[model samples]
Target chain A: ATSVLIVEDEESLADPLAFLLRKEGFEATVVTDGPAALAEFDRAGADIVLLDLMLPGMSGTDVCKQLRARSSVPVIMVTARDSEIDKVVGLELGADDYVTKPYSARELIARIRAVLRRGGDDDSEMSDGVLESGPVRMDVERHVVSVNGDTITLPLKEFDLLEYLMRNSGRVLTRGQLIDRVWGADYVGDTKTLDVHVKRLRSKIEADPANPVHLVTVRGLGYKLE
Target chain B: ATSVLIVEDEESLADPLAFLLRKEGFEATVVTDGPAALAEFDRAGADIVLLDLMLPGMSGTDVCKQLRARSSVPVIMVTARDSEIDKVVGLELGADDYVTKPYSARELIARIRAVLRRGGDDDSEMSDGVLESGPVRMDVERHVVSVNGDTITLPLKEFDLLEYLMRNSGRVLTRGQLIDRVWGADYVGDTKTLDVHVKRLRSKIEADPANPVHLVTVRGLGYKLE
Candidate 1:
């Protein structure tokens, strides 16, 4: 089920909006301020965010900025005026869309669905048995790996590692996070094992494995697939 | 003098831009591709960036996304048409403004100057012998630090450290970066010293020193002033 986190301060507006969204089959959660909104997002990821431009403690733009830092979650700003929309666009706060105050519930819902459809289409393209990033492509079901249209075989562990890396192509996944995800959470092993696997995968995927471009390790952080 | 980084593919456009900008008494550097643009940016920071929407290897939007990740430098998108402007704005690519192709050189320069003025206004607010982030305020000239308007005195090292952090608020300053800036390069000391200073700063500034809100450590990365 798709989840929507609504960051709106007004209790009257938030309560009814949550009800309407839940009625429309979205698992909606509401938070009153920016800090709470971020906390909720970190606790449980959401498919979309309905963010109000004006909030009590922190401005909505700050919330959107912080959100964009970590995730590519779709955000639709609920602004009070058309003028604020210019600020949103000017700052490039990364809001997918926005609705002005005095908007019909139906109109807002339509916009939400439109944004979701756009997100869904992108997801389907990646999730439809194949995932591609730069020179690499993965056929999940068939367990096929190809780089630059040339098919290559991989060990089961290497394939799983590459799959997870591809799924989060541009994000920096820490060594601990990668180990927990690729290896079982209970797998108590040296981090050196993950490094060895990364080295092996880089040889197959990278043009110059010693100086990788696609799968590179971020110093003091972790690995990220470009 | 303010510096501008121009990321445009066309030599016709880029060469003339470099000439015009130099004539305007502004330092301008032109790079034809996104990778070079990022490299140049890291090599020497710019006051503003003029980025074309289209490039050969990497999309301008992707370049802008990467730029926004580390720096808050003002960017003005040079787009082909009015339609691409929507894509730039809708994506919240954080472009301050954009100019359509077939624009007069004068108009483009005017827009660039206007954006710079806007940026300058913001910088002046922060750099005018005073720096502020959240509740913490530092008067550089007076050597005074205040939290919630309550003046609190700090030692020379802590003052300098907080000043650096306040200047680059919301950015993760690696321990090395902080130590180098706060302590001289020749002064090689334990990183634990930096941690101790941070704890002392938090005690003076934070309402709850044990769980600081304003000055927080980003685990493996570094410390960031909220």
Candidate 2:
């Protein structure tokens, strides 16, 4: 099981969080103070740390600083205040991400998974700004894309859209989600533009545009990059 | 001149907002309390109302309710809290839109203009989900478009893109802003796709596709519809 060290003073918050993490198949350890958290982490290293911004002695900031000085273990700051200063400070101190108080369990879990996935990529073959899934390989920094060992050309939008799809290769992305990610949030244009773009992408990448295997559409949902 | 009534108790917030509105060529009025705002509006009607959610007394909700009871003047709620409930309740009370505290002067002005434009459209010839600019007229409800008094066919995305441009005709919309509004915030594609779409739109509506006047690119910015 993935190990998580939770550094939170309030029993009300930590106990429930520990229970939730356990239920989600994570090995969770709870500590009431910043010192105890450091002691526990030194004694038995954790995969990730959920450090509370406000803590009893030593402070979460100091703890994060100390943790980063020695190790690159991911630290997620748990904060009560959603002020810009707190977020900036936490991020500057090398926190992977910060979730404000009153966050949903689903949201927190998603963040944890995302941070872990990003960190996990360092050990994978597709490290250093390179992303590979199946036969598709993208050298993001060089803006190069290849499929089945053949170099392919794509316009700017198509490249960006393909990159996003390749990043979340197996997941089914809704038309709305795809459009929002690719076009932007303020886009007031038609959803059909997305379809046109998809068709164009299919023509470029898929062996048989009429009967695609890699980029397939879900009947009522959206599209998936297999 | 367009008139704006600002209903806020804080002198610091209200004073600066009043000054900004006046600077932007608007007739501005400021009231300290809910009753005073109602009285002022009754005496001399305002084109729009910027109602602060956290008021001294009678609550902003109550003020909005009273305003909606007899009038349809656009009400934009100025909120300190960005919670979902506050937004839902305010919108339910018939506020045209709500802006969170510490908003930029530019953002507030844009919102005010957008709300006023929507309200103004109700009294125009293209009322009831119809939009018109130059030789183009769109019956949004029926998803139909016409140019030069002749009906024209458009794919879903092209129609939507045209509609957005027509709505904000004569304004230079940046490529980023256009993509955000049309494709959505999450769009991750290359901007060149936007260029392609604009080219398609020009081919359909412009008298000369090579030298477009109705839908023209504003150099490095984006596109505009005239």
Candidate 3:
């Protein structure tokens, strides 16, 4: 069943939304505050998140940033009426879509369905096969990477970033494309995640971590595997 | 076999839907009245429920409330003409999805498939990679943190910060640079978020959170993982 994490403080709205989402064949989990939302999310990241803009303690936007930092789960913002600024910021903060308050539950479901479908497409395209380029090797099935016959362990995000770069070897992948493909579509995390992960990746596989060979940065563009 | 419980009154529509659903390899059960639908739902609890909004005297909304009051079974409401407008707040009515009247069997099946497949992405548990510095050991892939091999659970941000610091090891990152790298450049929230996370990170990884050892705060600067 589909799982949805609802981050809303209002008892009236959050309760009803959870009820309907469950009815929709989704396993719904509701957290009353931003902190609880992050905890639940870290415990078991949800497939999608329904986040309200104004939240107590850690605001919804901060929650979005935290979640984005880890996983590429989809997020839909729930803003109050006439909060156009909130809506824009929500999108800027990486929310896939937004629904205003006092809105019909039906429309919310539709938007959820829409965003879910958009995310679904990206998943299907993920090829679970081994990718090799020069010294680095990635086996998707076993989730292992090797450099020059010596196995090099990469963190989850670094492994993914390496896999994407190696798969499209010689092809320059822009920062956005790297994020969209490796991180999935709704990556609202820090932009620096890519660069840091890149540096980390280079440190592992490259003989001289300072002077990278296979993975080369394209300066203004992105990174590519030679 | 996957089963479908259809709570629709109109024989003309329900019969064909049942036939197609059966043809598609589902065990289909048809219940025409609201009372029967509830009773059947309670008894069998089909994998999914196809409900008609315009039912006999009991009304689809009432049946929905009573049925939902019992279970979180998936419900796709069937609405007639402009009746969908009223049911769009369907979430409030505990409806998962609603199809407008004169729907194609293919479209209905697609909707059923879509709703069923929600929350299918649970592959976050990737393989593991370990990073070590001084008394700290970080499992990069599995997101596990530990001191002298005893496990520690850092919040999402803290984990990322630790990972970055661990990767750099001994390099003192400036406050702006740390915030820029860890929180991402687009993070337009409180700079204090960085501070709280660092404090939290120090408490978790250091001998004492107050007077730290591994995660050290450089006065008037940032922090470093020594």
Candidate 4:
């Protein structure tokens, strides 16, 4: 069953919206508060969150911004009548979509399906299996990395950097992008860390350390997978 | 942060819901299938789930029941087309709330916040300020289990089960009752799993796991905390 969470406050409306989604072939859960919504989201691992922007104790807007700092879970806003400012702000913050009041349930369900399918396939940089000329295959979930056919042992950072490059094979990502994608946002201004990781990756995956088979650099533009 | 999951099959419903939630400040994700919804539930770690009761692969009611079986993640069912059957079925399956179609965003947020405010997350056994035995002592929130004056790791499962037994100390629980109360009724597997977990727990907490101390085995009957 596809899972949907409804964060409506009033019992009258939230109940019905949840019912419609049930009829339309989805598994839905409903909570009536901000704190509970967060707790439920943590436990359920909901794929789609149907959130109302105005909430008690905690504002719906704060929930969105704080949540984005931790996860990429897509959010859809259920705004009030003529809540245009709220709608725009929701989108800029991180909402994938929004619903206006006096809306039809049929139309809302349509938007949810589109977003879920979009999550199915994304701006995945790790489309190809290899690092250079498509020679190495790295599987993220199983923590497996192989060259041609044989399995090769890689330390954690080397694997992480390799996975990052493979995901963004065609794009010429900047050094800043590399830092953000692989090392994380808190890496400060350290560029040598990237160099050290790249060197380590070359030693594990390349035939020659000096003339590497993969992990090519673009100097100004950082590096791309291919 | 408030977390939300949307289970709508259509993009129209899912997108706007995401948008509205973003405006409110929630981290949300959406999924479109029953099994996938369950998988995402594991990933979501949500406080509440806004579930559409009818879905592909698994029925919404079944999903709700399954969720209740595993954990106390609150669930609100979504009903389509104003059907009482869905509502009653959902409530019977352990849904905390329900929402009908064509609902207001503010109302939804209010309900979400309401749910977030309530719950009994811990199930433990204590008296006064301490959980005391002859020489052993256990404190629930502190995660401390002590033998005499020294704190001990006491293994994971043993401490949890011990707490359960201690909570209902002196009760002559059967083996089936022990499993249901300690391991939780949602655990669906061989009784041996319980036995194994119990043994592993005893190995650490007990002075002699074979002879046992606070954990007293009752042969064909059951074990008690005394």
TM-score of each model, paired residue for residue:
0.23, 0.25, 0.28, 0.34
Which pairs of residues collide in model 1? Answer: none
Per-model clash counts, in order, read 0, 23, 5, 139
Candidate 3: tens digits of C-alpha lDDT, residues B89-140: 2322222332222223222323333333331122222323467898888766
- Preferred candidate (lDDT higher): 2 or 4: 2
Each model's lDDT comes to 0.65, 0.62, 0.61, 0.56
User: For residues B1-226, what per-residue lDDT tens digits would candidate 2 score against the true structure?
Assistant: 7677877776776676566556445678999888998898899987667666556657665776676565754433333444432343233322222222233323222232233244234343354566888888887656778886656668755775776787787988888676544553323463877888989888878789998888988897878897
For candidate 2, what is the DockQ-based docking class?
Answer: incorrect
Q: Which lDDT tens digits does candidate 1 get at residues A1-226?
A: 6676877776776676567556444578989999998999899977666566666767776776776676764544333334444444445533222222222322222222233333223244345547889888777666687887756668866876787788788999888667544553323463888899999999998889998888999999989898
* Model 2 stretches with alpha carbons more than 4 Å out: A1-129, A149-152, A186-188, B1-226
| TM-score computed on alpha carbons, candidate 2 | 0.25
Q: Is candidate 3 or candidate 4 better by DockQ?
A: 4
Q: Higher TM-score: candidate 1 or 4?
A: 4
> Which scores higher on lDDT, 1 or 3?
1
Q: For model 4, how does the per-residue alpha-carbon lDDT over B116-181 read when each residue is reduced to its tens digit?
A: 322112332224455665556667666677776555565654565666665567665666655544
Off by over 4 Å in 3: A1-226, B1-129, B186-189
Name the lDDT value of residue B11 in candidate 1.
73
For candidate 3, list the clashing residue pairs, or say none: A2-B118, A2-B119, A3-B119, A24-B96, A106-B88
